[PDB]
Design a binder for this molecule. Structure first.
Ligand code: ATP
Ligand code: ATP
Ligand code: ADP
Ligand code: MG
Ligand code: MG
Ligand code: MG
Lengths: 395, 351, 177, 277, 351, 105, 52, 52, 70, 52
């Protein structure tokens, strides 16, 4: 069953299975915590069941921010109404020694597995950097008297990861929907610790760095993020057809990048410089402003329905939007907002005013004298040279 | 293009999410399809060995092999990822010993070692913890022998031993198309052919994502279906011409008409070999639909609807030709002029 | 008679009413020409401006005082402040004088315009100087040209254009000293 | 994988000198085209001080020529004047007039059927194979005399400098169909000239308009040939920079992969030797 | 552009000789200048840890911090290149203990681990001399834990714990802009922001050579100066537009007189964001200059005068503007009606 | 190299002069320390240099300073392996250099 | 690479050597024909970067 | 030697594919110069009917 | 010629070879950087066609057969 | 690529300035006067700054 997440590229090209495992790959600041927070915000509040956040080896500031954000949002209630809470946080963050980070994912799984097996209900299990479990076992295993495997890891990498990951499943008595961010080290998808984790997931969401350097957020690599749901007997026929058409247009653009690099767009044929324009349009249309990213971008977040993104990408695949500019597609929710932003961005190229309507000179009882304003400044005191000796000598 | 005989070992090599398990599943489902139209000495009883996958993937595959009906011929050996490394080490030998029962009794088998690379990873763990000295990529010395003594058990036995066979389909996952890796070079040199699948052709719409230039089968046309053999060498030749006319098609102004015909014909042939998964076509409909495109019957049809044109050709010719091409075993001259003309009264999605 | 004044200045407004605004106006070859016709001047006395051009070469731009042009009715002359003449030239010799010396090209047929500002503009295709013509093949082509009496009006027009050229090529080599 | 980058480095390293060779070839072609364009610019002056410049006429039939290039390495030449012959052919048709599309060059017939195919009639190529002369320009002028419009349109990139290619329009009025009709300004502006020709004014105007179209077409396909060589010189300077910057990226990636290869092979040797000792 | 809060971890990552130490030095010197103008409760005491540096450069730096008067608030924990590798491994922890003193008792601390890349080199030496198995770039597996154990101690403590804070500035030296190395991507996934200093902006005179598109601080926008929060929004917007038009119009191909407008606007904002070394600017004098450059009062000033015209703006504006903006902390709707008026009456060069 | 440093350090510390210590190919100092580190059985670092690469270069180059008595000013010829300016021996050596005098043919 | 062209036997003519390619063992007619073939093939491999 | 000096430069280039010696390439070029003209009238002409 | 050096070969050879070896060194160093350019010999400058003829004249002079040292 | 007459007048001035900067960077050396004959010159710093 599909999980509508309200993100365009995720719901279109690699749709999450309700109950499946989800992996968010990407390395060192591409957005695999902002994406997992927006997944928490979209799926988790409209879920119905419980949530379990297992932070494994990530920032303690992030755990404090998540804890206070869930307190301010009613997902976590303190004290007398604590039974109404719907999230358990389990934290083995990156200041903990390697014995603790290697075993806190198992604590998160045990708190989730009591809900799945005994309580018998749907839960959501978000894990922040399941890579830190593998890396912590690599730090431990260097001292346990073992011969090291390939690039420096433990020999029991696949079996430790399989012992952890095979417990995160849906059974006939309950359901764990698991999203796990997976750090790739030094931007290498062929590193053995992500390349083993690839085989344990239904839906994969590979966040790339170059797509983030293009400004496109979420920086999902659309030809590297796959799913077991992208199948016409599962998601319907027209969703699957527009997904394959989007991926074909992006792949045809990707094969042209070296000749566009040296020879420019003035060398391609008409059929190629059409697909360059359409693929640059659908590159921008995969971007979307998140609700949790609005604190540092300003643009409010967009929940995009599945029908909205299927129809919106069907339009740009057919050719119904060839006369809109590229930056109309940048950071918009659905196909109405790109047209609204296009009409607004050709209004804003014609928004010209003459003599710029100041009314700034001689404002009758708006501005005081400057000395009246400096009179409003209360004066702070300078408290005698840091006083550091005496309040150290209190001890 | 890459024909497979009963008794050889055909590697399925590619990157992740390219079609490897899909090609193996289509083979097992088509063995179920062929097992009902042949006598009991021609039936192929498949064995699926799943080393290192999740149990949810194995449950999806057992659900699929029950839904299609292929479970009554299939054995499913699954040492999964939570299972211990000696179990993932000894799972392909278990499945090969189960398939050797049908080989040694005159019947035919189809063993598919899914992710032989994960067997090699489990063996690497099992040997590194036994304090055996590692080598390249920390693999032991005898990891060539590990796969060679497993794959050489897939044999077509002689007539004095029942004449049975065993076809092996090892699946190898590579990292970013790197076949210069250790286990990949080992099992490439061990096996007969290779079905080399690419992820840059998988996303160009060409699915099953077979890289035709590198996918070979070293039995050649010795165990190709005649009739398919009569068009297949020309199919190889025309795709070979289309591949060497490529990397010049960015110049659409370059009107040649000596290269554009093969550049269009190769596009129709590339669009011809696309196929949905979980639906394997019988061999007679396949050779009829390649006889439809190698002769130029589809040359009027646009390149964006040959996947419907082939279904219309198969569904609008008589269902009486496939019955006699399945029995007669080659395109007889009492059939090539019948179905020259039966492909004239079919209507096409292309104008 | 004056209900459509087209031109280079008026082309810009009718262009901008129905063009994309990114493109500047398509430019005009009259914007690179310095001497007009209805503009008074470019005379200044005795030396009048000539312009003897060919396509493959520009052979004169400077001032002359008397130029003789092989017209279709006879080798007429143009002095300083002349009558405006649209003058078609026959194949013949042009004579350009600046004083006692004379530079003489055998031209091969092309118009020459005197304007209402005193400029003359001799526009001929092939202009050969008399010291670059071979005076030996002037009769070997002419004999075969006068002998070739064809059956078609196109080829006999070609033969007529041949023989009127060759007959002027006779006296272009004889009486020059 | 490590063999892909070292071969790709040699690929980009030979591309970056192939394009620089073609750049200096284009410069040496521009250096001899620069004297031919200055020998052939001057003959458009007497006709435009005689026939004027009448682009926006009430022509009932019109013929447009887009003078484009033959080879395909120009870099913003044939598609610029494609947009100029789009926007200019937006402008002339304002009363439901016929306009015939002609283009000169292999990159022009492949760039003008995209916008105007039913209005396309004639395509000329192979024009700059050896050089340009008045013969072939007069011949394609005759092929536009196979049509009989009221006016002619020319589009070509005029070689102002080696950096500026002004897309110049040249409008050539048909003589007794439109030229004397556009000159009837308080009488007729052409009657100040005295006809010395053998026949009447209409016939010397006919010969004159044929010669004027032929010489502006010769000038157009010489200006455009020289600006083609200049634009290929500029576009294979920007391309050498791109294939030098991609080579600068690929050498750094090769050196990262080289150091990682030596570290990986070394770590494998050390782990294998320490398993025994 | 990348504003920094108290309790943050901000990585100053760059290449060799691109001015990372200069950013850290200006931060320490500015904390000296700002400590005398605040109450005792909000005063930042700095620590400069010098790991793997030359002793001469630390000697010049101690000379600079004493001749500024910044050594009154600075501790210097110097482990030079001659000192043994456990000392360079331990000196970030000694410095972080010395600044955790100030963090724990309600005071505020700043710490600069200068070249944590050299601390990781020292720890790689310690690990390989302990015969420990190495990994990526021959680093031990716990070289991430080495840096995360250290950088997690930079915190903003609660009201129950004193309220003190510790702000860390790790410096990381990349090689050829290789921001995807092992230690660089280790510290990128620990710290809150990133200050990426490009070498090519540095070699074009643009100093501090801030890569504006890559350097971020998603934790600071909530914690910056409220005048600069409303002034520098159009600064980062116009700098993004300047970067994209100087990413597309680099060839000198087409001019539009609107993209040329944002070109000559970003070419003035970039000249404004230049700064001489060892001379920090108080934040109100910063935001008045950024106001004057984004509200168009430095328009028509030539692109070689804004480093003089900005001194003209700072010298010729009434100092009550800076006092009011510092005390209120926001450009009040009365204060900008003062401020644009007093910005028009400024003798700008060139005119 | 330490012997040349010691003869220079006598002029700096006792005679009190300004010395020019010339170290021809600091890279060969690096690779000789790499050889004598591998011969003592130490596990080599990245590309093949010793684990104590930065400390061996530091122990050489940190005695070339200006004291209160005199100064050693060193002119070190630098070889770059495989023309890699990110190779660890020039990446560790360039961290000590104050000036490069690139001579060109 | 030659097998990608379909040419069989896929022998590389600019990598296959012998000590029997001296003109003192096979004669000048065989040696000069073999060296002419190697010359024209190396000319073609040096022109493939332009004709691509 | 013949294709080196230019003795057989008038043959097509694909007559040489999979032939033994210099005579069989001539016969294959003659077979191609037959069969380029065979695809002119080869469809009906009571030649591919259902009753022959 | 580009990658073969001899760092004593600056004046350690036959003096009669030194009369011509500097001209041979420069006339090939002029040729190695432009031979990669114009594999085509169609449209060549007068300053580059002389180097692309002299380099080919000197390169085929500098080859010799086996077992026959001069 | 184009010519010494193609560039500007002030760019020709900077060509003159730079081509006499490149000569003035050169200097005879006192260690070379044994085998070159021309004497060497220790140039002071202030003379270099005031010369350039
Ligand atoms: N011919 C095809 N047509 C349509 N979809 C296909 C085809 N082949 C594969 N797919 C889809 O592509 C995805 C590829 O998964 P696949 O079965 O190839 O896994 P694999 O590469 O064998 O191994 P892994 O599971 O490790 O990726 C599947 O979701 C499958 O449904
Ligand atoms: N803002 C600036 N304005 C002008 N010059 C600067 C600025 N910042 C740095 N520089 C110059 O850059 C040079 C190197 O600066 P700095 O010492 O800060 O670099 P670094 O990053 O420490 O390099 P390394 O780590 O290799 O020593 C110094 O000489 C300094 O004068
Ligand atoms: N949807 C988004 N919109 C805007 N910026 C984003 C988005 N996602 C990620 N970012 C950028 O990524 C940074 C955070 O990366 P993060 O999510 O922590 O990845 P990681 O956990 O891999 O470090 C933020 O500073 C922000 O600038
Ligand atoms: Mg994170
Ligand atoms: Mg699979
Ligand atoms: Mg520094």
């Amino acid at each position: 069953e599909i999980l509508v997440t309200g993100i365009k590229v995720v719901d279109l090209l690699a749709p999450y299975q309700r109950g499946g495992k989800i992996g968010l790959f990407g390395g060192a600041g591409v957005g695999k915590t902002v994406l997992i927070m927006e997944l928490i915000n979209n799926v988790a509040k409209a879920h119905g069941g419980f949530s379990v956040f297992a932070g494994v080896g990530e920032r303690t500031r992030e755990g404090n921010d998540l804890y206070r954000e869930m307190i301010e949002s009613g997902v976590i209630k303190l004290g007398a109404e604590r039974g109404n809470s719907k999230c358990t946080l389990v934290y083995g963050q990156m200041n903990e020694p390697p014995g603790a980070r290697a075993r806190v994912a198992l604590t998160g799984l045990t708190v989730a597995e009591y809900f799945r097996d005994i309580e018998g209900q749907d839960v959501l299990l978000f894990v922040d950097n399941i890579f830190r479990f593998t890396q912590a076992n690599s730090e431990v295993s260097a001292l346990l008297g073992r011969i090291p495997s390939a690039v420096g890891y433990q020999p029991t990498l696949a079996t430790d990861l399989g012992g952890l990951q095979e417990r995160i499943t849906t059974t006939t008595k309950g359901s764990i929907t698991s999203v796990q961010a997976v750090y790739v080290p030094a931007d290498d998808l062929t590193d053995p610790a992500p390349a083993t984790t690839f085989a344990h997931l239904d839906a994969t969401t590979v966040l790339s760095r170059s797509i983030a350097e293009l400004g496109i957020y979420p920086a999902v690599d659309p030809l590297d993020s796959t799913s077991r749901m992208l199948n016409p007997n599962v998601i319907g026929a027209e969703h699957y057809n527009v997904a394959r058409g989007v991926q074909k247009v992006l792949q045809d653009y990707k094969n042209l990048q070296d000749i566009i690099a040296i020879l420019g767009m003035d060398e391609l044929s008409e059929e190629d410089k059409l697909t360059v324009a359409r693929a640059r349009k659908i590159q921008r249309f995969l971007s979307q402003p998140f609700q949790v990213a609005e604190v540092f971008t300003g643009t409010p977040g967009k929940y995009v329905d599945l029908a909205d993104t299927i129809s919106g990408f069907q339009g740009v695949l057919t050719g119904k939007y060839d006369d809109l500019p590229e930056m109309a597609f940048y950071m918009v929710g659905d196909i109405k907002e790109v047209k609204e932003k296009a009409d607004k961005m050709a209004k804003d190229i014609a928004s010209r005013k003459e003599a710029d309507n100041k009314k700034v000179s001689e404002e009758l009882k708006d501005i005081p004298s400057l000395d009246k304003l400096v009179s409003e400044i209360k004066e702070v005191v300078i408290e005698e040279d840091d006083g550091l000796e005496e309040d150290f000598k209190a001890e | 293009l890459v024909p497979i005989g009963r008794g050889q070992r055909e590697l399925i090599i590619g990157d992740r999410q390219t079609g490897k398990t899909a090609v193996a599943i289509d083979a097992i489902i088509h063995q179920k399809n062929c097992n009902e139209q042949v006598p009991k000495a021609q039936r192929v009883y498949c064995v699926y060995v799943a080393v290192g996958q999740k149990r949810s993937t194995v449950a999806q595959l057992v659900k699929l092999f029950t839904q299609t009906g292929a479970m009554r011929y299939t054995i499913m050996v699954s040492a999964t990822a939570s299972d211990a490394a000696p179990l993932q080490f000894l799972a392909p030998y278990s499945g090969c010993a189960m398939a050797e029962y049908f080989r040694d009794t005159g019947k035919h088998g189809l063993i598919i070692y899914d992710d032989l690379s994960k067997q090699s990873v489990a063996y690497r763990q099992m040997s590194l913890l036994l304090r055996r000295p590692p080598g390249r990529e920390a693999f032991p010395g005898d990891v060539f022998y590990l796969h060679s003594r497993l794959l050489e058990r897939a044999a077509k036995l002689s007539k004095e031993l029942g004449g049975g066979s065993l076809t092996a389909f090892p699946v190898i996952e590579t990292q970013a198309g790197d076949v210069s890796a250790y286990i990949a070079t080992n099992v490439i040199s061990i096996t007969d052919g290779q079905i080399f699948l690419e992820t840059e052709l998988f996303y160009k719409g060409i699915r099953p994502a077979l890289n035709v230039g590198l996918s070979v089968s070293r039995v050649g046309s010795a165990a190709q279906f005649p009739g398919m053999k009569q068009v297949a060498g020309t199919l190889k030749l025309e795709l070979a011409q289309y591949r060497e006319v490529a990397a010049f098609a960015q110049f659409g102004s370059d009107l040649d008409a000596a290269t554009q015909y093969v550049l269009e014909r190769g596009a129709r042939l590339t669009e011809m070999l696309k196929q949905k998964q979980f639906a394997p076509i019988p061999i007679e409909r396949q050779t009829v639909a390649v006889y439809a495109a190698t002769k130029g019957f589809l040359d009027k049809v646009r390149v964006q609807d040959i996947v419907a044109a082939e279904e219309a050709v198969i569904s609008q010719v008589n269902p009486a030709v496939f019955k006699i091409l399945k029995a007669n075993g080659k395109i007889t001259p009492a059939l090539d002029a019948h179905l020259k003309a039966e492909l004239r009264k079919v209507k096409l999605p292309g104008a | 008679e004056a209900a459509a004044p087209a031109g280079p200045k008026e082309f810009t407004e009718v262009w901008n009413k129905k063009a994309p605004s990114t493109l500047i106006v398509p430019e005009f070859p009259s914007n690179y020409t310095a001497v007009k016709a209805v503009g008074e001047g470019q005379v200044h006395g005795d030396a009048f401006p000539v312009n003897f051009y060919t396509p493959h070469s520009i052979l004169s731009q400077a001032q002359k005082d008397t130029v003789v042009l092989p017209g279709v009715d006879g080798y007429f002359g143009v002095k300083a402040s002349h009558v405006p003449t649209i003058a078609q030239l026959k194949p013949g010799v042009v004579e350009l004088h600046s004083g006692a010396e004379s530079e003489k090209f055998f031209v091969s047929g092309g118009f020459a315009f005197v304007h209402p500002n005193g400029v003359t503009d001799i526009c001929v295709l092939e202009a050969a100087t008399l010291d670059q013509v071979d005076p030996a093949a002037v009769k070997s082509a002419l004999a075969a040209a006068s002998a070739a009496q064809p059956t078609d009006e196109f080829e006999q027009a070609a033969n007529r254009a041949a023989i009127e050229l060759y007959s002027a090529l006779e006296s272009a080599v004889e009486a020059k000293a | 994988s490590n063999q892909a980058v070292k071969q790709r480095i040699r690929a980009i390293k030979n591309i970056g000198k192939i394009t620089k060779a073609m750049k200096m070839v284009a410069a040496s072609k521009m250096k001899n085209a620069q004297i031919a364009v200055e020998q052939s610019r001057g003959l458009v002056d007497p006709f435009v001080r005689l026939f004027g410049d009448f682009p926006a006429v009430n022509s009932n039939k019109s013929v447009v020529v887009a003078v484009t290039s033959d080879k395909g390495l120009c870099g913003g030449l044939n598609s610029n004047i494609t947009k100029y012959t789009r926007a200019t052919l937006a402008t002339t048709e304002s009363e439901g007039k016929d306009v015939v599309v002609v283009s000169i060059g292999d990159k022009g017939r492949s760039q003008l059927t995209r916008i105007e195919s039913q209005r396309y009639q004639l395509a000329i190529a192979d024009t700059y194979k050896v050089r340009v002369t008045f013969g072939q320009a007069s011949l394609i002028v005759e092929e536009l005399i196979k049509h009989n419009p009221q006016s002619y349109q020319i589009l070509f990139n005029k070689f102002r400098s080696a950096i500026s290619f002004k897309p110049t329009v040249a409008t050539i009025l048909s003589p007794d169909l439109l030229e004397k009709q556009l000159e009837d300004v308080t009488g007729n502006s052409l009657d100040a000239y005295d006809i010395e020709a053998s026949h009447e004014r209409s016939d010397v105007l006919r010969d004159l308009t044929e010669f004027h179209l032929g010489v502006t077409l010769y000038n157009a396909m010489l200006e455009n040939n020289c600006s083609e060589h200049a634009s290929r010189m500029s576009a294979m300077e920007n391309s050498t920079k791109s294939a030098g910057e991609m080579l600068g990226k690929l050498t750094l990636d090769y050196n990262r992969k080289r150091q990682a290869t030596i570290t990986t092979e070394l770590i494998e040797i050390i782990a294998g030797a320490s398993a025994l000792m």
